[model samples]
Target chain A: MQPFHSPEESVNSQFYLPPPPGNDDPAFRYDKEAYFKGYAIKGSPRWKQAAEDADISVENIARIFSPVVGAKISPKDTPETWNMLQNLLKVGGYYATASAKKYYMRTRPFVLFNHSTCRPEDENTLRKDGSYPSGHTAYSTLLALVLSQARPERAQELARRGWEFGQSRVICGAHWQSDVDAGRYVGAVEFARLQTIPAFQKSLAKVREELNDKNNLL
Target chain B: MQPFHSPEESVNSQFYLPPPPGNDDPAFRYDKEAYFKGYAIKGSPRWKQAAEDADISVENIARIFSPVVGAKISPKDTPETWNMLQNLLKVGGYYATASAKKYYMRTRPFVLFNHSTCRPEDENTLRKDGSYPSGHTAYSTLLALVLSQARPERAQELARRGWEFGQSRVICGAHWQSDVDAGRYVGAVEFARLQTIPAFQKSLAKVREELNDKNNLLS
Candidate 1:
């Protein structure tokens, strides 16, 4: 799916950060080593979770966050709120990650290591895309941050889930731990910036209102 | 305080992770820019929390994690458990960060930004030391992981607190966010390796026994 805002229009565009740590950097190499090293020991207890997260569809993220407020909104349900969330997620989630991905052109873990990841079907395209600052991790984390705002009482659970969402990427062998780490920071930054967009605030208020009404029924 | 293990003995010593992202890297520069930008608006509402976390003392971390098991341990109280904890923290906390810090020789945020952090009194010495992979973040996180093992029921709370402990450094401008991120991964790695050591396992078992007895008092 295409992002609502292009990388140039992102709030962070002017700062022009270099891509996440590169292969040349010793840290990046160690990150690759850690991937294989951790893989041998940990395997992938969360393999299913990681595979599910690789899909960035609106319905998927919404379903994942549904447990927090005890209400699930599919693409068909709450059409207006869903549409707005889609735009917001595109703007906040892909801003830094998409930009860096385009710039660095780093290869994915499975491709570099000549190993398999959870999503082999998409490996050809993924191999060409830059690996740093994972988009799935960023989008999922952005979803968590926005939902946490709507249901502040569940903030801890949402935050923990968001962190684990990123961790899943590492487990699945799609990304290096450093890539996921950088994605988390990027997601947090985008979440903070989301407040500045008047549309996002209005949409958030609407989502909160509907969720409150739904929860009242329970 | 000196770390019990040297860089040579640390699990991560052979990896030679590059220093934290440098100023030349676009992402690194952007990270610094965001820090200042966010600071301009937020102005550190959690300044108190950040300042408190800057200490990295055993008493401070013990207090932060105390609510987990519903009891607190001080340097003066439970001298045996306290001493064992001191050694555990020393061995687990600073090994990787200290090694990387000495090798990297990077500057601190306060010095680079020419701004004062929450702990101004320590800024001079801090500037002299390496800034990547924050020691406080590593030490406090190590505290949380170890404490969580003793009280598995509060594992989630303990983990969240450990994450926040690292976030405090970003808020206080003591470290780049990358430093805290790397510090956390290092702490987790060290914690995983701690199981291999007989001395650590014995100390952990002893601390767990004492804390279990202390926690029973609450019920």
Candidate 2:
């Protein structure tokens, strides 16, 4: 459960976001409009995408990128590849976003508007977590960053998935647009930090090797 | 001078921006109010600050980050590091924003208001560029993303500098607040795309090694 860097040494995210837009700020108004529009489309395929992105377990997360990489990205199927992803998160993901999340305690759109997100059951626990930077969104971008590296030929496809994954947070009413936006930056800084770690290089090699293995492919 | 990809293959910033603000809308009004607010601060310390950030030469821009990075970030001081930055821009910089710029055809604050900017000489050229998203701001943020990656310990400071470097445009009355905001997203996306390139990984390593050089730093 321990992260590679202590909170102090980890890439701090507070610097990346302007404090969640104030109630009167134009950005906040934009966030509200963005939220309502997403809320209106709850029954659509768009809603399904957001709900799917809601899960952040390393294995579940791996499945979402299966189509782009054309590999069966299974933690079970390619344990070393999954281990690389898990290890990278230790360098940044949820652990890195924690400080800014606690410091801001920004309200989730669903909580602020008295509505529920695509994933209804998460509302209670998510209520307690500050919503400045969505952890799931951060993790998604981190996955995109590392995976794209392994499969550079599929980088553009990987890039869109990372981006849409963050946008999914906004569509689900689980986060403000700025929260999702800030998550990209936090996720990126986390990605950069991971590159400097000795262990990450080995992990990257293992993941890339797995990607090339016929056994890991469908 | 040309980018790695031509205008035909530009990063589609249309996807990154909200539709360009409509005439007389609150977003437009907010753009208006922000312009004058920036105009009012002319010649103040913040005003002077924006003017400095306006110089987007890789070297001058690199200087803005030195205080945060604790390194002498001059193109002259660190040739390979600077080369990496310049080369990375070829992949996506002004070229990437070209797609959305021409698509929106939004007018600049100074063009609409007929006011002079910190650098009046640029008014003629800048007038032609769309203001839906500021190109300079995007480049600034891109620099922040790459440099911060190299110096992860200073991520917070680098992030703050990048945000304000973009905000400086609003402060200088050359860009709308929204224009600058959209630029950050575009810049970050460009950074993502760069990660997928083989040359970029080599570029990153050289820059890191340059930063590790003692001779590159000030006495």
Candidate 3:
């Protein structure tokens, strides 16, 4: 129903340092070079589509991870698994990005560079929000963790895909390199905190049951 | 007590990919550049000593984190907190690294390159181990997770130090770039796994209480 913890309790305030004021800082420089590399990949086909497909709004998060999962993970195909995964994304993923993004107000890379971004004309709506701790990466990385936990054999592929999902943000110019990395830390921390809650435990059990039955969930 | 889980239970088998063969793999190229950077810093005082401080063999783990923690967490000064933290490290951190090292059989960068590493006179033994996942990174990273949770305000500093600890392995020519990266993931995932255990909870509570008492833990 609610996020496992509030913004006041998140490790974000401390874990993700504010982007340094100048480009001279070594950490800030890392962001610039990575963003530059992303810009270089802007027109390429496979990489570009990978970034395009990583959008969380149009694509179901379960379907995004289904390739690594090797099955259709959707509301119709796997109900409980789908619901539990969504709840984890809403709580573990959303709140992880929510507080950090609100506080940081990091400008999107395309906006800063005065370049057109890869996405739709929705830029007018999207421009109003903060860019640090990408929300999509927050959700997608958590999905990978739970998915990897469920199917231990596919762990590397799932982990790699989750990384690519966050990386898509950089490639899309939607977020800086570090934001995606920080979102990863945020998502993992959220997963750890969620484990401490019984409601999450119940949801976890329900999915664990469904996920166990290849005839049903997997 | 045994570790919370065995190496087979670790997500490691599938999470960390094996080092690709040959120098041409882009992933392997990243290693070449990273190690070259390490070689570049081989003789500098500040960078080299920072790498030297990272030698876990001699340094007490508590002292390694004290600067980030803003406290004196030595065994004599903070025994209970120290014990719990050590148990967490031995379990969450050690097991996370053990199997991957045993399995990868990936040669240490120094061994692969046939160069001397940073430490003094420790060469004969260090040369033999696998270098796909740095062990010191596993311990330092898990240490960061708990310490960060205990003092949320210091999370960035703690996380930064944990990374520096791993980066030191690269600087010392003791590990490849990806090894350190995978070790961090291994550390954090183990931190997540350790949470479900009652003993980890008990240990966590003990450290949390101590860490909360500024007079005892923080300076």
DockQ, prediction 3: 0.23
Model 2 CA deviation exceeding 4 Å by range: A1-6, A88-91, A212-218, B1-43, B102-106, B112-115, B131-133, B176-179, B192-203
Ranking by DockQ: 2, 3, 1
Q: Per-residue lDDT for A80 in model 3?
A: 68
Number of the top candidate by DockQ?
Answer: 2
Query: Can you write out model 3's per-residue Cα lDDT over B1-219, one digit (the tens) per residue?
Result: 555455665556334444433456444655776777778866787467556655564236766677677777766666666776666666555566766677767878888778987874666766666776777777777777777666666666776677678778888888886777667666766665565457667767666667667676555
Give the fraction of true interface contacts kept by model 2: 0.32
What's the ranking of the predictions by lDDT, best on top?
2, 3, 1
> Over the full model, what C-alpha lDDT does candidate 1 score relative to the true structure?
0.63
- Deviating ranges (above 4 Å) for candidate 1: A1-179, A182-218, B1-7, B13-18, B41-45, B75-77, B214-219
Instruction: Give me the overall lDDT of model 2.
Output: 0.75
Q: Which digits, one per residue and each the tens of the lDDT, describe model 2 over residues B93-194?
A: 577677778888888888777888886766777888888778887777777778877876677777778778888888777888778867776776677666
Ranking by TM-score: 2, 3, 1
Task: Name the lDDT value of residue B63 in candidate 2.
Answer: 67
lDDT of 1 by residue, A67-106 (tens): 7545656555455457756776677556656767776766
**TM-scores for the candidates:** 0.52, 0.85, 0.71
